Amino acid sequence: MRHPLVMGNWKLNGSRHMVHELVSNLRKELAGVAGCAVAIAPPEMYIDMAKREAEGSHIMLGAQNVDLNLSGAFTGETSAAMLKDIGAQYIIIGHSERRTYHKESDELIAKKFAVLKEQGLTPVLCIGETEAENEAGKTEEVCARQIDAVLKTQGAAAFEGAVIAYEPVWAIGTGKSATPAQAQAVHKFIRDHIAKVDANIAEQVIIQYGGSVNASNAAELFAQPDIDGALVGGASLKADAFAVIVKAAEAAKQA
């Protein structure tokens, strides 16, 4: 009975022309969708415009990162209070691109998670193992560590309403890809890990697949029982492709 969520991570892509075109096309392609929740995370300067463009549709807003302070003398930072104020709900934290390029630690990401919960925002907690970690047979240990930074400091209750996105980092720019069976094995492990602390919370947590998802492979991934949607990368930038993914999630999970 978990209602799927398909979220578009636009990454560093956007312009006022593009926001209008893409959100308008998304509204049209998604106007008949009932069985899947949808969120988009444009670059921070476009959240307000995208929110305005999405008014009248069921498309929810989000953001790609957040910092730790709500206000103060912190030049260039992003406030959870302001993200809430501007209309963002689903906030991506711990994306592999930020863990790598910006050295964001497990502990820092758990702190972001806490700030978001205090604001009534929905963290989209990204976790996943690297190529070296995967080769060492560490997939489970790494996912557990990343989840534990939150679970062991804030309890299972912190995952009520939250979203986890599993990114097999080892499949990024390596030519490789995870199969739906491989993806499912990891999602079931993540859910079982949380279940060790609170089985009820585990059953309600939305676990999205964050590896490569496109119009072609969405159906096979969403047929898996512990895959509750996707955090979509490149396919998020074209309304037609993104819509096929949303409809595939709808079809896979509907009664």
Contact indicator for 225, 184 with CB cutoff of 8 Å: yes
97, 104, 167, 250: which one is catalytic?
167
Site track for Na ion across 39-78, x = CB under 5 A: -------------------------------------x--
Of 28, 74, 107, 225, the one binding a second copy (CB under 8 A) is 74
29, 53, 95, 250: which one is catalytic?
95
How many residues sit close enough to a second copy to count as binding (CB under 8 A)?
40
Of 1, 34, 56, 72, the one binding a second copy (CB under 8 A) is 72
Contact indicator for 242, 250 with CB cutoff of 8 Å: no
DSSP code string of 112-140 = HHHHHHHTT-EEEEEE---HHHHHTT-HH
Residue whose CB is less far from a second copy, 91 or 206: 91
Contact between 175 and a second copy by CB under 8 A: the answer reads: no
| 118 catalytically annotated | no
CB atoms within 10 A of CB 152: 11
Side chain identity at residue 142, one-letter code:
V
Contact between 43 and a second copy by CB under 8 A: the answer reads: yes
End-to-end CA distance of the chain: 9
Alpha-carbon distance of 206 to 228, in angstroms, equals 6
- Least CB distance to Na ion at residue 189 (A): 31
Of residues 212 through 241, those in contact with a second copy by CB under 8 A are 233-234
Instruction: Give which of 163, 58, 60 is closest to 117, Cα–Cα.
Output: 163
Stretch that binds a second copy, among 4-12, 130-138, 140-148, 157-165 (CB under 8 A): 4-12
Which sequence positions are flagged as catalytic? 95, 167
